[PDB]
Amino acid sequence: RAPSTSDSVRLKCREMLAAALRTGDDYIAIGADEEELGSQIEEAIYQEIRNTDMKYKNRVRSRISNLKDAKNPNLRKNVLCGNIPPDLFARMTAEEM
């Protein structure tokens, strides 16, 4: 569903987001497509920021750090299950996460 990209920076960020989504192995039992979710999250970030510079990388990094948060597994699970859509997650504030 997310558009493809041929931008190497965007591709790496999609892969990094997919990897963060694998935290704790929850994605397997849930049956989530972690690569597709990663692409949808990245797409929403790129659509809002519209470049791959500092603000873009910061946003990607903050989504990743929260997905990897051992203290907040329900955040990741909500994204994996689709309770939180990827475009919402892309723009969620730290407070909201």
Nearest CB to Na ion, comparing residues 29 and 70:
70
What is the C-alpha separation between 16 and 96, in angstroms, rounded? 22
Does residue 94 touch Na ion according to CB under 5 A?
Answer: no
Does residue 15 touch Na ion according to CB under 5 A?
Answer: no
Does residue 76 touch Na ion according to CB under 5 A?
Answer: no
Site for Na ion in 32-71 (CB under 5 A): 65-66, 69-70
Which structure tokens are listed for 68? 């990897």
Compute how many other C-beta atoms are within 10 angstroms of the C-beta atom of residue 89: 23
Where do contacts with Na ion occur on this chain (CB under 5 A)? 65-66, 69-70, 73
